[PDB]
């Protein structure tokens, strides 16, 4: 099995994890100095948010140089020391590859906006890197992702006197993927980090590569053909590396980003479809949407693995739910207007769940039990909160809370001088929520998370097994089996806030003896018709194995 | 029923609870400012720790005066305005009436140590307030309560050329209740206080205030007789006022401190026998000794009400258990030698349980669901810790952690300047553990404790019902009914740290449905032989109702 299929992933931002030089901004020596924490947590793969030169208008997703380290973060040598130190402990590291767009400061765009003809009359080879219209009327009816900021995906450049296309901020013009030259520029950018030993990339915003009149300009077959060539290049020149897709689409579209056995595409795709449903079910005490949306997801190819997640550095996206589900999620998880942004909710995991550790634990166990490799949002493992006074999605990117000291140990700069201010409020601030506290606390959420990954790590069925929902006769009780190489696990979760009963249909397993995976406390052998009664307490989770 | 049977009791110490003036010592004006917090928590009755003037060689239980206010805590003025406010919100206030002994610095000993006759020739009336002994051989077959500090109960005084008796410290000379001017002086002690508004007293060290040869000098019939007088004096002169007794003995010998219907002693008595087997059964994951010690209590009189508790201002006493049980307890709950004292363990409740909230919540449920009126020890509702760098049992008596400011909000004096230092450590300290934080946090242990009080108060069969244990087929699962007034509670509690299956014996309720007390989700209907199957997750509590 390929290494990503057994990996626990951890998403962090360099600028926001550990400040190492007192200026208030995270950097590569600060991260390096913290690799022991990441390793002893149970993390296998670090996914780093963009680290390139950038004005930071979309926090570095507006790349101005695909081949440097951003001056806030240190030097290209600092990055080389970090990559070497992470590999010595057995961590993989992936980067973030912004294929769809660059920053409007990228030298390419500064050359492109000078018109099709550079002022001495010869053709301007860069003008064509980007996507231009005389009046910005093409691709109408296509939607706007940043609904609270942009009013058109086209914008007029003052010096070219034409419009350019951008699916995101106006400072992030789309790259033109019908220009073969653009394809090689990025294959070459991927080559520069892969040559240095990077283990692969998260690949950003992949559904939006190619645009076509008369289409939504999402999931276009031309976009898949490009992504196929990225994999064909990685497959030939860098066997073993990982390509992981960001694609918030509906199930029948997401699964396509794996390609096929004959035409592979991505190795991994975030399971965006399940993520909203975890939160809906919890609030409805009805888990059917989890089962319904899961059942819409086709089998993926042999090399493929889902990456399961609860929250990331973005808002909780309601882009891919129905109008009614969206409206239901806003009412349940966004009671204040300031809580929402671009068809999303911009809150951290713990505040989404009313800080109820039981609910945090339940979803964290659903995160570890579905088919796939899990990704942890940095700081979620100590129960970090949010700062919704910050703009856009910055509120869920406050600094990591290392201890109760100056700026939660993130920096020796004062809180007001850090890149984003470290949280200080009585519930979620660093005096109460910090890593030092929770390493010394015997029953902290940090120790739980570690123990629970330790638990997962000891049963490969969690990483490689099939999946089979079990009828429970109570919508509050979600039940499934995970089967692999002999072992059968049976996973039972109550999404209600009080005690619940069910009749598990274990008819296929009559005469088997369930045991807890933690300590093998025995449960009644399944007998008779196999209709098996269970009771559960509020948010309980049963991790069992079925012995034959 | 009488108000005590239906009340929530809160134990606190004025010195430790809230400083009003700035000198690092909790005073009555300050306690009076925190009366709303106790009201909103759902507490009915404050049991205070001795507020009387003292040298404090045993935090107020070496009493030098019985009829005034220790100047640390403020004035008698202040006490008035305090008892006026506690009553102006619906709070009963009881007091600690220290009986078997006084402080060696109490006028009646100061005078008594001058000998059996004054130098002028007139018999010293006071010399026989206390027990004396020419050659200290009278009363050998006796144990010393404080075995870490006292070698014997006799202490040779100098100025009276004589030994004198103390069951506790040499600075607490025992009182002589073969003297009737003594008895009068402690009926007169009371009269002082109940006449101002007080509602009763906890009675200190009842089983030891009468001593006689050839015996064990505890629980002697001569001793119970005086107590009957106190009750008699109180029923006669102050009707509807409480008497609660510290009676750490084996069960039957304790029940005797209630009186009988004919001649009655104490209304209320701490259920010392059960409090240790809770801790034992959690570690053993085997509740059998919880039943056994409740199954060895005799029924109690009508007016009689057990007082239930988990922890208090002392250590966790292990005095009344078998020598096998006392070794296991130490092995389980005192890994470090300096955590023991006087055949006991001097740790707070949250550290005793590894700061594991699930375990904390569990014992609290069983607290509030066993037959009695419960007493909560201050700070346990937020999870406070213990400081073993304090002497005696003062490690579980640190300042109330109110917020995250100067000294936890307990005082404006810095931590070095407080009567005892607040706790500052990364786990239990007041930057992480305080009231302000827990007021603001939807799922805090504070709000959980007051939610569970609200839930106890909607179901009077907790205070007033009887009690019947139910078979479960698994010693880890403790279940019992509490019936009263045509309502039946079914209380099911799992003491194991992993999931447990049980077979509950519900034969008497065939055709009834258990429904959760919280949220009213019904469980399946008891059918057949009433062998009702259950599964529980680690430390679950099911609070159910059985409908006709
Ligand atoms: Ca594009
Ligand atoms: Ca005595
Ligand atoms: Mg820095
Ligand atoms: Mg004071």
Judge whether B517 and B489 are in contact, CB under 8 Å. Answer: yes
Those residues with Cβ within 8 angstroms of residue A480's Cβ, 6 or more apart along the chain or in another chain = A369, A467, A468, A469, A470, A490, A491
Per-residue CA distances from B304 to B263, B296, B409 (Å): 13, 17, 39
* Domain co-membership, A77 together with A126: no
Same domain, A148 and A189: no
Q: Which of A426, A457, A488 is the last residue of a domain?
A: A457
- Mark the binding-site residues of B for Mg(2+), compressed into ranges: 19, 21, 23, 25, 27
- φ, ψ at B21 (rounded to 5°): -95, -40
Pick the closest to residue A47 from A376, A461, A286, A405 (CA basis).
A376
- Give, as one character, the DSSP assignment of residue A530: -
CA distance B340 to A520: 34
At which residue do the structure tokens 């039943």 appear? Answer: B291
Same domain, B113 and B166: yes
The whole-angstrom separation of Cα A448 and Cα A357 is: 11
Q: Coil, strand or helix: which one is A455?
A: helix
Distance CA B442, CA B24 (A): 31
H or E stretch covering A483: strand A477-483
CA nearest to B173, candidates B187, B186, B155, B185: B155
Burial of A140 (0-12, 13-18, 19+ CB in 10 A): exposed
Radius of gyration over alpha carbons of chain A, in Å? 24
Which residue, B363, B276, B392, B292, is CA-closest to B327?
Answer: B276
Judge whether A257 is annotated as a binding position. Answer: no
A514: burial class by Cβ within 10 Å (0-12, 13-18, 19+)? buried
Q: How many helices (H) and strands (E) does chain A have?
A: 16, 20
Query: Which helix (H) or strand (E) is A333 found in, with range?
Result: helix A323-333
| Residue B504: domain span | 466-547
Q: Which residues contact A175 (CB under 8 A, 6 or more apart)?
A: A99, A100, A101, A102, A129, A130, A131, A182, A186
Write down which residue in A144, A174, A204 finishes a domain. A174
Residue A259: DSSP 8-state: B
User: Which H/E stretch holds residue B96?
Assistant: strand B92-97
- The two structure tokens encoding residue A222: 């031309």
Please, what's the b/e burial string for A247-259 (b: 16 or more CB within 10 A of its CB; e: otherwise)?
bbbbbeebbbbbb
Query: Which residues have C-beta within 8 Å of that of residue B438, sequence separation ≥ 6?
Result: B382, B444, B445, B446, B447
Cα(A535)–Cα(B315) distance, integer angstroms: 38
Q: Smallest Cα–Cα separation from A140: which of A148, A155, A152, A157?
A: A152
Structure-token pair, residue A274: 């399940």
DSSP category for residue A7:
-
Q: Which residues pair with B123 in a beta bridge?
A: B117
CB atoms near residue A486 (< 10 Å)? 7
Residue numbers in A near B356 (CB within 8 A): 442-443
Pick among A359, A362, A365, A426 to test the B interface (most B CBs inside 10 A): A426
Give the B window 382-441 contacts with A, CB below 8 Å.
Answer: 403-404, 425-427, 431-432, 434, 436-437, 440-441
Domain total for chain A? Answer: 3
Longest dimension (CA), chain A: 88
Q: Note whether A340 and A432 are same-domain residues.
A: yes
> If you write DSSP's letter for every residue of B211-271 in order, what string do you get?
--TTS-SSS-HHHHHHHHHHHHHHHHHS-S-EEEE---S-HHHHHGGGB-SSSB--SEEE-
- Asked if B125 and B55 sit in the same domain, the reply is no
Q: How far apart are CA A335 and CA A328, in angstroms?
A: 11
- In chain B, residues 94-133 whose CB comes closer than 8 Å to chain A: none
Residue A264 DSSP symbol = B
Structure tokens at B281: 């059964």
The Cα-based distances of A80 to A28, A32, A76, A234, B239 in angstroms read: 9, 10, 6, 21, 83
Q: How far apart are CA A485 and CA A465, in angstroms?
A: 8
**Residue-wise over B39-69: b if at least 16 C-beta within 10 A, else e?**
eebbbbbbbbbbbbbbebbbbbbbbbebeeb
Residues 6+ apart with CB under 8 A from B319: B248, B343, B344
Per CB-CB distance under 8 Å, the chain B contacts of A521 are 496, 498-501
Distance A377 CA to ligand 1 centre (A): 27
Neighbours of B239 (CB within 10 A): 7
Q: How far apart are CA B503 and CA B533, in angstroms?
A: 5
Q: Which residues of B342-373 are buried (b: 16+ CB within 10 A; e: fewer)?
A: bbbbbbbbbbbbebbbbbbbbbbbbbbbbbbb
Q: Are residues A302 and A432 in the same domain?
A: yes
Task: Please state, in angstroms and rounded to a whole number, the distance separating the CA atoms of residues A298 and A378.
Answer: 30
Phi, psi at A344, each rounded to 5°:
-155, 175
Three-state secondary structure call for residue B310:
coil
* Alpha carbons A320 and A247: distance in angstroms, whole number: 11
Kindly report the CATH number assigned to the domain that includes residue A498.
2.60.40.1180
Report helix, strand and coil shares of chain B as percent, to nearest 5.
30, 20, 50
Distances (CA, A) of B262 to A96, B259, B302: 84, 8, 11
CA distance B477 to B473: 8
Contact yes or no for B393/B348 (Cβ under 8 A): no
Q: Give the residues after which the backbone of chain A is interrupted, taking a C-to-next-N distance over 2.5 angstroms as a break.
A: none
Ligand nearest to the CA of B413: 4
CATH number at B34 reads: 3.20.20.80
**Residues in CB range of B256: below 8 A, 6 or more apart:** B219, B224, B265
Instruction: State the DSSP code for A101.
Output: B
Regarding whether A374 and A258 lie in a shared domain, the answer is yes
- A90, A39 in Cβ contact below 8 A? yes
* Cα A313 to Cα B191: distance, rounded to the nearest angstrom: 68
Task: Please give, one letter per residue, the 3-state secondary structure of A175-232.
Answer: ECCCCHHHHHHHHHHHHHHHCCCCCEEEEECHHHCCCCCCCCCCCCHHHHHHHHHHHH
Q: What is the CATH number of the domain that holds B165?
A: 3.90.400.10
Distance of CA A229 to the CA centre of its chain: 23
**Per-residue CA distances from B187 to B64, B195, B218, B227, B247 (Å):** 17, 12, 21, 10, 20
Q: Give yes or no: residues A184 and A301 share one domain.
A: yes
Local structure of A165: helix, strand or coil:
strand
The radius of gyration computed from the CA coordinates of chain B, to the nearest angstrom, equals 24
Instruction: State how far the Cα of B377 lies from the Cα of B393, in Å rounded to an integer.
Output: 14
At which of B112, B141, B174 does a domain end? B174
- Report the distance separating Cα A495 and Cα A513, nearest Å: 25
Cα–Cα distances (Å) from A171 to A104, A129, A142, A316, B330, in that order, read 5, 15, 19, 23, 67
Please tell me whether residues B167 and B41 are part of one structural domain: no
Distance B21 CA to ligand 4 centre (A): 5
Q: Are residues B147 and B274 in the same domain?
A: no
Question: First vs last Cα of chain A: how many Å apart?
Answer: 26
d(CA A34, CA A23) in angstroms, rounded, equals 18
User: Going by C-beta distance under 8 Å and a sequence separation of 6 or more, which residues neighbour residue B242?
Assistant: B4, B45, B92, B94, B199, B200, B201, B267, B268
| Greatest extent of chain B over all pairs of C-alpha atoms, in Å | 88
Phi, psi dihedral angles at A94 (to 5 degrees): -115, 155
Enter the tokens of residue A96.
């973030």
CB B544 within 8 Å of CB B518: no
Calculate the alpha carbon distances from B421 to A448, B175, B416, B417 in Å.
Answer: 31, 34, 6, 8
Is the CA virtual torsion A30, A33, A37, A43 positive or negative?
A: positive
Among B355, B440, B518, select the one facing A427 at the smallest CB separation.
Answer: B440
Residue A204 annotated in active site:
yes
User: Which one, of A71, A72, A129, lies nearest residue A99 by Cα?
Assistant: A129
- CA nearest neighbour of A60 among A98, A22, A26: A98
Residue A24: alpha-carbon gap to chain centroid: 25
Contact criterion met (CB below 8 Å) for A109 and A173: yes
CB B467 within 8 A of CB B371: yes
The dihedral sign for the CA sequence A413, A418, A424, A430: negative
Same domain, A426 and A481: no
Residue A534: C-alpha distances to residues B160, B221, B263, B499, B535 (Å): 73, 54, 52, 11, 6
Claim to verify: residue B239 and residue B167 sit in the same structural domain: no
The residue assigned the tokens 């550990």 is A18
Q: How far is the CA of A419 from the centre of ligand 3 (A)?
A: 9
Could you tell me which residues are beta bridge partners of residue A501?
Answer: A535
């Amino acid at each position: 099995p390929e290494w990503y299929k057994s990996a626990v992933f951890y998403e962090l931002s360099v600028r926001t994890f550990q400040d190492g030089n007192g200026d208030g901004k995270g950097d590569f020596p600060g991260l390096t100095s913290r690799l022991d924490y990441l390793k002893n947590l149970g993390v296998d793969c670090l996914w780093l948010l963009p680290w390139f030169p950038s004005p930071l208008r979309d926090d570095g997703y507006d790349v101005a140089d695909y081949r440097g380290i951003h001056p806030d973060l240190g030097t290209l040598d600092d990055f080389k020391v970090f990559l070497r130190e992470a590999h010595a402990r057995g961590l993989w590291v992936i980067g973030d590859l912004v294929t769809n767009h660059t920053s409007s400061d990228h030298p390419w765009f500064q050359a492109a906006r000078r018109g099709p003809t550079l002022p001495d009359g010869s053709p301007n080879e860069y003008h064509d890197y980007y996507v231009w219209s005389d009046e910005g009327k093409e691709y109408a009816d296509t939607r706007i992702i940043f609904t609270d900021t942009e009013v058109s995906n086209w914008t007029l450049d003052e010096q070219a006197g034409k419009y350019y296309w951008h699916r995101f901020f106006a400072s992030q013009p789309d790259l033109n993927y019908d220009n073969p030259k653009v394809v090689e520029e990025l294959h070459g950018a991927a080559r520069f980090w892969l040559d240095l030993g990077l283990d692969g990339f998260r690949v950003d915003a992949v559904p939006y590569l190619i645009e076509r009149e008369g289409t939504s300009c999402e999931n276009l077959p031309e976009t898949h053909e490009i992504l196929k060539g990225f994999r064909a290049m990685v497959d030939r020149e860098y066997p073993g590396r990982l390509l992981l897709a960001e694609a918030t689409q509906w199930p029948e579209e997401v699964v396509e980003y794996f390609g096929t056995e004959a035409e592979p595409e991505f190795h991994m795709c975030f399971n965006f479809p399940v993520m909203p449903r975890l939160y809906m079910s919890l609030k409805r005490e009805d888990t059917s949407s989890i089962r319904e949306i899961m059942g819409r997801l086709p089998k993926i190819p042999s090399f493929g693995q889902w990456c399961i997640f609860l929250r990331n550095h973005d808002e909780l996206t309601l882009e891919m739910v129905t109008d009614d589900e969206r409206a239901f999620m806003y009412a349940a998880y966004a009671p204040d207007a300031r809580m929402k942004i671009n068809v999303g909710i911009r809150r951290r995991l713990a505040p989404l769940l009313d800080n109820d550790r039981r609910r945090i634990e339940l979803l964290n166990t659903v995160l570890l039990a579905l088919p796939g490799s899990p990704v942890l949002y940095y700081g979620d493992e100590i129960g970090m909160g949010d700062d919704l006074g910050l703009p856009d999605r910055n509120g869920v990117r406050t600094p990591m809370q290392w201890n109760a000291g100056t700026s939660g140990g993130f920096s020796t700069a004062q809180p007001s001088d850090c890149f984003f201010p470290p949280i200080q409020d009585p519930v979620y601030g660093f005096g109460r929520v910090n890593v030092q506290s929770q390493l010394q606390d015997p029953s902290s959420l940090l120790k739980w998370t570690a123990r629970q990954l330790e638990l997962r790590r000891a049963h490969p069925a969690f990483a490689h097994g099939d999946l089979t929902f079990i009828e429970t006769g109570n919508p509050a009780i979600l039940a499934f089996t995970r089967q692999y190489d002999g072992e059968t696990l049976l996973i039972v979760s109550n999404f209600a806030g009080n005690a619940q009963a069910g009749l598990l249909d274990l008819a296929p397993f009559v005469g088997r003896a369930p045991v807890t995976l933690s300590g093998a406390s025995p449960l009644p052998v399944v007998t008779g018709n196999g209709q098996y009664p269970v009771v559960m307490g509020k948010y309980d989770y049963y991790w069992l194995r079925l012995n034959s």
